[PDB]
Design a protein around this ligand. Structure first.
Ligand SMILES: CN(C)CCc1ccc(C2CCN(CCc3cnn(-c4nccc5c(=O)[nH]cnc45)c3)CC2)cc1
Ligand SMILES: [Zn+2]
Ligand SMILES: [Zn+2]
Length: 340
């Protein structure tokens, strides 16, 4: 409650010594209340690089590029995907940097943000999303998205790294992570990626708003936002009193999403991001209480293993369906104890 009361997006600058232990740093940023915003930025030490050069990836295959068709008006939009045939990074880059798809000329972000919400339904861009793989070198032990060594490893999908090749106007709709997990996003290179976040304590208010605007979608599926098709502009969130914050992620910076932190955003132009999910001991309760997509046959993790290992006291009580536990969104992870 006292740590980060404003629930604003916090930016962190760890030293090389702070940065070497990933799981410890997550506990540290939570003791600082970063989780309250639902999104945090981590700028790594200048000496740190996950790869020496991004020169040898032209022939990397993007198995399923998606053309994003957006329909909507007055801040409310639905994004439909059209899967295209496999393309390489070289071909994707040519299309991203071409006169048809390149970033418009602008001065400040506010102008580019305006151009985004004004033009998101025109000239459908291509998103080189959900590419199985990593751009990290094998010797990189610090913050390796391919091997974070968190408690989520107990599961083995959701623990594997994904690549996202963006172009101007490519977007990610309002959503929380699968099983309401944490996510790590590293911007390898290229143009920025802008982000919007709703604090987890206000997450239910966003759902409430989304249900009112898409009632057909709300009846068919209780967790329709997990379809990742719903785009709601910041001006629409302001109109209906939803608290949110924005941040721009530049190349070489990490973004951390927290359990039940709703986020959306867009790519400024040609770029590449690496993403995976992870957990801490705080996530277990969110996983047990997560409202999952019913209509699609989706990412569902059996919580038994986590409850039997970290909550043995509550395991039989939870298996009977008696655990009436109410999640406190403001509370940091138990691992943060050393920083308090
Ligand atoms: C499983 N797969 C994960 C799907 C999944 C979850 N979050 N998420 C995203 N979260 C944050 C950022 C991005 C982004 O920049 N682009 C695209 N997607 C993003 C994408 C399926
Ligand atoms: Zn996400
Ligand atoms: Zn569904």
């Amino acid at each position: 409650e006292t740590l980060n009361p404003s629930a604003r997006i916090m930016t962190f600058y760890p030293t090389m010594e702070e940065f070497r232990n990933f799981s410890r740093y997550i506990a540290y940023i939570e003791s600082q209340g970063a989780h309250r915003a639902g999104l945090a930025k981590v700028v790594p030490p200048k000496e740190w690089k996950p790869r020496a050069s991004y020169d040898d990836i032209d022939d990397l295959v993007i198995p399923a590029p998606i053309q994003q068709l957006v329909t909507g008006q007055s801040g409310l939009f639905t994004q439909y995907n059209i899967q295209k045939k496999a393309m390489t990074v070289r071909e994707f880059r040519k299309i991203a940097n071409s006169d048809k798809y390149c970033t418009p000329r602008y001065s400040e972000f506010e102008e580019l943000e305006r151009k985004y919400w004004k033009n998101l339904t025109f000239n459908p861009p291509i998103y080189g999303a959900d590419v199985n793989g990593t751009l990290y070198e094998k010797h990189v032990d610090e913050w390796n998205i391919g091997r974070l060594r968190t408690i989520l490893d107990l599961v083995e999908g959701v623990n594997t790294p994904y690549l996202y090749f963006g172009m101007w106007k490519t977007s990610f709709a309002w959503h929380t992570e699968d099983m309401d997990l944490y996510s790590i996003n590293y911007l390898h290179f290229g143009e920025p990626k802008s982000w919007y976040s709703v604090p987890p304590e206000h997450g239910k208010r966003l759902e409430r708003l989304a249900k009112g605007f898409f009632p057909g979608s709300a009846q068919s599926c209780e967790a329709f936002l997990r379809h990742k098709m719903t785009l709601i502009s910041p001006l629409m969130l302001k109109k209906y009193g939803i608290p949110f914050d924005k941040v721009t992620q530049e190349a070489g910076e990490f973004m951390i999403t927290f359990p039940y932190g709703y986020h959306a955003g867009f790519n400024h132009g040609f770029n590449c991001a690496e993403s995976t999910n992870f957990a801490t001991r705080r996530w277990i309760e969110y996983g047990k209480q997560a409202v999952l997509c019913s209509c699609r046959k989706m990412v569902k993790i059996s919580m038994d293993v986590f409850v039997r290992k970290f909550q043995p006291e509550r395991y039989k009580l939870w298996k009977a369906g008696k655990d009436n536990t109410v999640i406190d969104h403001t509370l940091p992870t138990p691992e943060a104890a050393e920083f308090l």
